[PDB]
RNA sequence: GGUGAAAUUCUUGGAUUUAUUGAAGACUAACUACUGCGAAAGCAUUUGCCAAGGACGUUUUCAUUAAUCAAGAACGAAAGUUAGGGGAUCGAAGAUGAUCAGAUACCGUCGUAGUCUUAACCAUAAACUAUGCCGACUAGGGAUCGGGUGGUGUUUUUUUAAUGACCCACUCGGCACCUUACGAGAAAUCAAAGUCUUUGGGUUCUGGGGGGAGUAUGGUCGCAAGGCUGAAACUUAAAGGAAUUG
């Protein structure tokens, strides 16, 4: 029963603010509201509550993350660069 | 593969899925092998590993989350520990495992 | 027998360099180029100027301590012409005929595993 | 009103051991004054000389060698392994049309812990009686050949440092064992180690360094 | 009023039977229950705190001290981090690149924490309406909203006054200006739309 | 009409190759369509050989020439190197000389 | 005039009638 | 330094040259060819992993399941747009040095965007073989790529082999060239552009003198630039093709 050709959650903002500005918000709200896969128990029960604070429905783990998505791109690359460099200490 | 073996065990042998039942197996000495999820927490791990060594049961740590171990045994839910009770035509007991 | 150094001749078009250095390189010994021995810009790379410059080079060469030298000829290279300049041979000719010694020489032009877009534009230099 | 030559401290370059003439070259420094002496400053230079220029025999016209200066003593400074190149003219010859090229390389550690990466280039050969004009491998050939070369190169190193690794390259033992395992797969010609560079020397260890000296 | 989450990290007390709790700025990926290691001879994983000495170059580090033992100072805002780019073993320094891009050299005894700070991208979302700005500063300080000096009277501002709204004189103001003079672009060495790429060389 | 069965130059079963730059004017030009001259010539020259080996160490030495591949762009290949222009018949002849 | 430039010619010309017509939307 | 020649430019800040190191982004030289692969766009460093494909082999299996296709859909160079990153190189814009009568250019310098990547758009190229697909038939030749068959063939040594590469004959399926021209064409040319007034294998698409014009208008798609669809009034006797001689 498709409700909006294109505004999705951004439809709350009515005609205000100008399309381009609403677009940007729509991207980050779709991000910041979705349920995410939990690393520790594999259930898709991680949700946000306050920027950078993602925690788990069941299992009750809280992981410090990005402001509107659990893993920021840059920290992810940082991860593997700590991966990489640490390897040079045992081997 | 390791999953190719499990797929045989699945269609010709006996197995139980999940934590509590495989402890009924580990104590009964019925378990011939237990497969452990990557992300299943260390406490449960360490326990299963202690119950195992108390029954001389070998332990194969699956390098996959409890979700993919669920497709490994071909069940549409997740599983964080399998217990081999009978290995059918497969050889998992007497190969690399 | 002789005391050895390293010659190194960069003969592009529009100029020609000759400067012997210590066989390690880190220490020079006298430069002088084909530009210095003439003034016409247009004439900064002709073999005559390269000769006179090889002269002025060999002179201090045999006047400091180096009696012999290995040479390393070299074009502009990079993404450039990769072909030697006119006054490269004229300088080699003018330093063996000078009276110094010659010992085993190779070409050290920087040739790439090609890239960095050559200049000039896709339509080339059209004139 | 200076002329740095009328001031230049002078010096001569000594070579290592497993070759021919331990006397190599000449250099220029600057007098060892208090604050900036001739010693600790430079020395540690690098001079490249064709090994036929230091082995005498011309069956080594290519194969340039890079030496690096480490220690100094009374107008006499030694030098140790720092690299091995190839002449440009040689490869620029070698690589002829109508045939296949094959390159391979690997990074490896030795005994006395120098970490280095060596190379290895080799070209297919026409076999005597061929009528077709080109003679190329079969890709699947080149994968086998690289893997073998790689297996052989990883073996010939981690032996007794460069010293013995150098003692292996000088008579090109590697080139011939490559040739041996290779001929089962595909002809090939030339076949050299071409390049080998340093990238992780261990530590000074002056006692071990002096092992090529007498 | 902080962009990035904090993280309470409990420790034992070496000298008395008790727990002592600290308040860290949570680096990204840090999770409740995780163990955090803090010391010279500690390993190189996100969340641990290690002196700038003990990390190879390219390590990425947050909340790093200026002086050893000032308990953190650089890169603390949601998303920032410092990169180590080199060490001086004799005179034990380390050289780092701060979030601004300035390169600074500090003692290697100065400590940082492995990773970046949580809450990245907080600024990518448009505030979108006055009220969200309003609430933003409600929890910060009384700096909102702002009136343009060019809407004031000359009594109120250097920009104040005129029958049209205009600065009247250059809005670049000397470093040696005086309180009451410095409104505009203080000590600006250039001005106008930054054309081309920025980025320190 | 068409004045070359090989079109610009030689390519059948590709549709796209890869441009190379012209050693003269730096013009991009597809590799198959290039025109290429192997420039192998002595480091020295005609006259320098005697005075070379004269003022030279070693028995006659060895002498190592320089090899470098050249690339021209038709226009630059016409302006100098391999061209003339040939009769309508003399065109089809791929005999090197 | 070159066909491509004559293409850009009317390419513009249209884009300006585009403007002009919107004056009366 | 740079050019036909020069100038703008760089140089106690020792430039250019040199040596030793390090950093970044791009790229894949030679090998590279009338050679490969892919529906096309397109695709050359190593290796590992992931799925895929043609040809061949086939005394396997199925048994008409197929050919070609309005609508509809997947992919689609380069530039261009949105949001991050990246931003070494080269470099639309712009500013300059010269040149010129002029010179908004050509050449030189600085160099914004771009060039690279990720998530999205855009859907066009002389996107070319300017040449629809499936099927049959019609003519000689030497090369070559992949598969296969035949050999008391060569070279590899060991103890003969086995292998591997190589040689010769054959046959499939390729990318091509050569000579022919029974035949075709207006010709250039063409093993199809042939088997066509002795006019019919199946099927898709397009064109109907030149301009006007891919313009106007509507519909549709796009953020935009634009894409698809797409007339008419009027004007005009030529426009055009291939070849010949000058
Ligand atoms: Mg409804
Ligand atoms: Mg011209
Ligand atoms: Mg094979
Ligand atoms: Mg903060
Ligand atoms: Mg404030
Ligand atoms: Mg207020
Ligand atoms: Mg205001
Ligand atoms: Mg304001
Ligand atoms: Mg007022
Ligand atoms: Mg006032
Ligand atoms: Mg004022
Ligand atoms: Mg005012
Ligand atoms: Mg105003
Ligand atoms: Mg082409
Ligand atoms: Mg194409
Ligand atoms: Mg209006
Ligand atoms: Mg290559
Ligand atoms: Mg319809
Ligand atoms: Mg594109
Ligand atoms: Mg750029
Ligand atoms: Mg301009
Ligand atoms: Mg002008
Ligand atoms: Mg202009
Ligand atoms: Mg210009
Ligand atoms: Mg089209
Ligand atoms: Mg074409
Ligand atoms: Mg077409
Ligand atoms: Mg035929
Ligand atoms: Mg056979
Ligand atoms: Mg015919
Ligand atoms: Mg005819
Ligand atoms: Mg008509
Ligand atoms: Mg309309
Ligand atoms: Mg948009
Ligand atoms: Mg439209
Ligand atoms: Mg149309
Ligand atoms: Mg229209
Ligand atoms: Zn959970
Ligand atoms: Zn050209």
From Swiss-Prot, chain A:
The keyword Acyltransferase does not apply. A zinc finger (C4-type) spans 38-59. The modification Phosphoserine is found at residue 39. InterPro entries: Ribosomal_eL37/eL43, Ribosomal_eL43, Ribosomal_protein_eL43, Ribosomal_zn-bd. NCBIfam families: eL43_euk_arch (TIGR00280), PRK03976.1 (NF003058). Keywords: Cytoplasm, Metal-binding, Phosphoprotein, Ribonucleoprotein, Ribosomal protein, Zinc, Zinc-finger. It comes from Saccharomyces cerevisiae (strain ATCC 204508 / S288c). Its main location: cytoplasm. Present with 44600 molecules/cell in log phase SD medium. There are 2 genes for eL43 in yeast. Component of the ribosome, a large ribonucleoprotein complex responsible for the synthesis of proteins in the cell. The small ribosomal subunit (SSU) binds messenger RNAs (mRNAs) and translates the encoded message by selecting cognate aminoacyl-transfer RNA (tRNA) molecules. The large subunit (LSU) contains the ribosomal catalytic site termed the peptidyl transferase center (PTC), which catalyzes the formation of peptide bonds, thereby polymerizing the amino acids delivered by tRNAs into a polypeptide chain. This is Large ribosomal subunit protein eL43A. GO terms for molecular function: structural constituent of ribosome; zinc ion binding. One of its GO terms (biological process) is cytoplasmic translation. The keyword Ribosomal protein applies. One of its GO terms (cellular component) is cytosol. Belongs to the eukaryotic ribosomal protein eL43 family. It is found in: Cytoplasm.
UniProtKB/Swiss-Prot annotation, chain D:
GO terms for cellular component: cytosolic small ribosomal subunit. The keyword tRNA processing does not apply. This is Small ribosomal subunit protein eS1A. It is found in: Cytoplasm. Belongs to the eukaryotic ribosomal protein eS1 family. GO terms for molecular function: structural constituent of ribosome. GO terms for biological process: translation. Its main location: cytoplasm. The gene is RPS1A. Keywords: Acetylation, Cytoplasm, Isopeptide bond, Phosphoprotein, Ribonucleoprotein, Ribosomal protein, Ubl conjugation. The chain holds residues 20 to 233 of 255 of the full protein. Signal peptide: none annotated. Component of the small ribosomal subunit. Mature ribosomes consist of a small (40S) and a large (60S) subunit. The 40S subunit contains about 33 different proteins and 1 molecule of RNA (18S). The 60S subunit contains about 49 different proteins and 3 molecules of RNA (25S, 5.8S and 5S).
UniProtKB/Swiss-Prot annotation, chain E:
It is found in: Cytoplasm. One of its GO terms (cellular component) is cytosol. GO terms for molecular function: RNA binding; rRNA binding; structural constituent of ribosome. Transmembrane segments: none annotated. Signal peptide: none annotated. GO terms for biological process: cytoplasmic translation; maintenance of translational fidelity; ribosomal large subunit biogenesis. The modification Phosphoserine is found at residues 43, 107-108, 197. There is a cross-link at residues 41, 67, 93 (Glycyl lysine isopeptide (Lys-Gly) (interchain with G-Cter in ubiquitin)). Belongs to the universal ribosomal protein uL2 family. There are 2 genes for uL2 in yeast. Component of the large ribosomal subunit (LSU). Mature yeast ribosomes consist of a small (40S) and a large (60S) subunit. The 40S small subunit contains 1 molecule of ribosomal RNA (18S rRNA) and 33 different proteins (encoded by 57 genes). The large 60S subunit contains 3 rRNA molecules (25S, 5.8S and 5S rRNA) and 46 different proteins (encoded by 81 genes). This is Large ribosomal subunit protein uL2A.
UniProtKB/Swiss-Prot annotation, chain F:
GO terms for biological process: cytoplasmic translation; maturation of LSU-rRNA from tricistronic rRNA transcript (SSU-rRNA, 5.8S rRNA, LSU-rRNA); ribosomal subunit export from nucleus; ribosome assembly. Its main location: cytoplasm. It is found in: Cytoplasm. One of its GO terms (cellular component) is cytosol. The keyword tRNA-binding does not apply. Residues 1-19 are annotated as: Disordered. Coiled coil: none annotated. One of its GO terms (molecular function) is structural constituent of ribosome. The keyword Acyltransferase does not apply. Keywords: Cytoplasm, Ribonucleoprotein, Ribosomal protein. Present with 503000 molecules/cell in log phase SD medium. There are 2 genes for eS26 in yeast. Belongs to the eukaryotic ribosomal protein eS26 family. Component of the ribosome, a large ribonucleoprotein complex responsible for the synthesis of proteins in the cell. The small ribosomal subunit (SSU) binds messenger RNAs (mRNAs) and translates the encoded message by selecting cognate aminoacyl-transfer RNA (tRNA) molecules. The large subunit (LSU) contains the ribosomal catalytic site termed the peptidyl transferase center (PTC), which catalyzes the formation of peptide bonds, thereby polymerizing the amino acids delivered by tRNAs into a polypeptide chain. This is Small ribosomal subunit protein eS26B. It comes from Saccharomyces cerevisiae (strain ATCC 204508 / S288c). The lineage of its organism: Eukaryota, Fungi, Dikarya, Ascomycota, Saccharomycotina. The gene is RPS26B. The chain holds residues 2 to 98 of 119 of the full protein.
